[PDB]
């Protein structure tokens, strides 16, 4: 059997701040052209979908792919890691915990660069495990004073849990109230219609639209995209095909000319925010660079800990 | 964790004849539209390539992807196999031996359909792993009396091993003499340019061009394509994009109108050979249907033997 890195191993091996460092470096490599990704490709027959994506990151000594089935809208994932030094397979890796940490770490990287530095109100659409991870990681990055939550399944107990975890009081709020009050809005839903009116967004707001990989899902309306100074994506290529919202946006939004790549933001090449008033949208799809980079870092850390071979 | 199938397990679990039966059935399914494939996709950075391809084959209860690195022409292959019934990951599978077996098995299916039935002279370009496996499986399928081999780098021992494995006298021969004398020609090299003059090919010949899957390399020349009655491919979408033997063809060759898919040949829909004198070319690049189908067969067979869960 190949070495298998499971979710519990990832939970202990990868801190949010390590995840942010690893992803920052991998994106800088991607921007310099010293790392490469495979776009997400989907195949389907008999109601069973198979998808693949991946990356080659020689700067971190790894290459890999994430492969997964989709059946009735449910996913089962395997990440497979190889050595970039000699090409040999290294390990398989669960995707659940890794994806939770990765999604919030990328949102933090983007908000750190593009949200107002003194942001103090976080709005959350969806307060399950991904929403809560975003709240924890963002609370560590910003001096937050409130977390406003919209999720019909949040309970007073979930709110106290998240509040205690973050050290910031969390409370329920209506969608229009979140949009109007929040400096940073994260949307983490399988919605197929817009979560709030673009008109309602606070001046200066950063929106991290995480949403879903599933067909027909979208969270933002044309107005939000039209209002935005910039729409930050992981990769020009994939994110402009993949995402429901970006593909749908009519020529009116001017979306095209305002799309900027995360690597350019992180490298300090984009100058995306011109003014305090600017709205910035970050659209996350998950690209193969991110999974591979974090699984490689986990492999390296667990190997050192356990006497596994170096990548 | 995951169950793993290694190269030694495939060597023992998978005969050529079984591989041919499994692959013939998978192609029929693909031909009927009930199975689907992912084209090969290649990603490269810092001299390290990562490739993926795969398939969903509900009829055989499996889906999966082969993922491999290439570093200086050297490959490391792993198949990730999933259940088409419930989507769950079933196994990792080393795929060195699998790849070797499936490529030769598919060429034997094509030759069985398209070469002269009483073919007795095999011409082989390339006496390495791939060429030798083709010679072995063809020696079982046809009543061969001679194997004529050209490989500019091979030692006398390699040739002696081929003769012994095949139970057929094997000798070194000049490319022009091979082309002139062979009933079946297999090209299994990394040559970037044609190996012999297409004008030299014997009337009636079946030519299995296996070595090239880069759009800038070709093993056959334009005259070969012109002379050929039919050029049979595994899947038009992939082959016509990848195979330099086809990409670089002059319009002169009439290639467009003579391309036929392997599934239509195996289903008895194609009638590709119109005359004994006809030359027929099979251009192979390797496609994900073959990998998935053979990995599923191996899994099922080993699972029955070892008590592993059913797909
Ligand atoms: Cl790609
Ligand atoms: Cl500020
Ligand atoms: Cl959206
Ligand atoms: Cl910026
Ligand atoms: Cl298909
Ligand atoms: Cl005959
Ligand atoms: Cl292959």
TrEMBL record, chains A, B:
Pfam families assigned: OCD_Mu_crystall (PF02423)
Q: Name one GO cellular component term.
A: cytoplasm
Q: Which SUPFAM superfamilies match?
A: NAD(P)-binding Rossmann-fold domains
Name under which the protein is recorded: Probable ornithine cyclodeaminase
UniProt source species = Bordetella pertussis (strain Tohama I / ATCC BAA-589 / NCTC 13251)
């Amino acid at each position: 059997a190949m070495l298998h890195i499971d979710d519990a191993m990832i939970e202990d091996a990868v801190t949010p701040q390590a995840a942010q460092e690893v992803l920052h470096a991998a994106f800088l490599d991607f921007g310099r052209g010293s790392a490469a990704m495979q776009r997400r490709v989907r195949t389907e027959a008999g109601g069973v979908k198979l998808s693949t994506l991946g990356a080659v990151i020689p700067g971190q000594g790894v290459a890999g792919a994430k492969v997964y089935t989709t059946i009735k809208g449910q996913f089962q994932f395997v990440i497979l890691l190889f050595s970039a030094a000699d090409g040999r397979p290294l390990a398989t890796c669960d995707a659940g915990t890794l994806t939770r940490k990765r999604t919030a770490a990328c949102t933090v990287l983007a908000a750190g660069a593009l949200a107002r530095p003194r942001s103090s109100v976080l709005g959350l659409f969806g307060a399950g495990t991904q929403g809560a991870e975003h709240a924890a990681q963002l609370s560590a990055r910003f001096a937050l004073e409130a977390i406003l939550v919209h999720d019909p399944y949040a309970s007073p107990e979930i709110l106290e849990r998240i509040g205690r975890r973050c050290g910031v009081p969390a409370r329920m709020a209506a969608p229009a109230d979140i949009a109007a009050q929040a400096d940073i809005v994260v949307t983490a839903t399988r919605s197929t219609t817009p979560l709030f009116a673009g008109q309602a967004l606070r001046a200066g707001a950063f929106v991290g639209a995480i949403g879903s990989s599933l067909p027909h899902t979208r969270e933002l309306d044309d107005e939000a995209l039209r209002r935005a100074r910039a729409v930050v994506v992981e990769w020009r290529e994939q994110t402009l095909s993949e995402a429901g919202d970006l593909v749908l946006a009519a020529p009116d939004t001017g979306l095209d000319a305002k799309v900027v790549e995360l690597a350019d933001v992180l490298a300090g090449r984009a100058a995306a925010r011109q003014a305090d008033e600017d709205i910035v949208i970050y659209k996350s799809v998950g690209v193969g660079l991110e999974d591979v980079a974090l699984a490689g870092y986990a492999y390296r850390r667990l190997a050192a800990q356990r006497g596994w071979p170096a990548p």
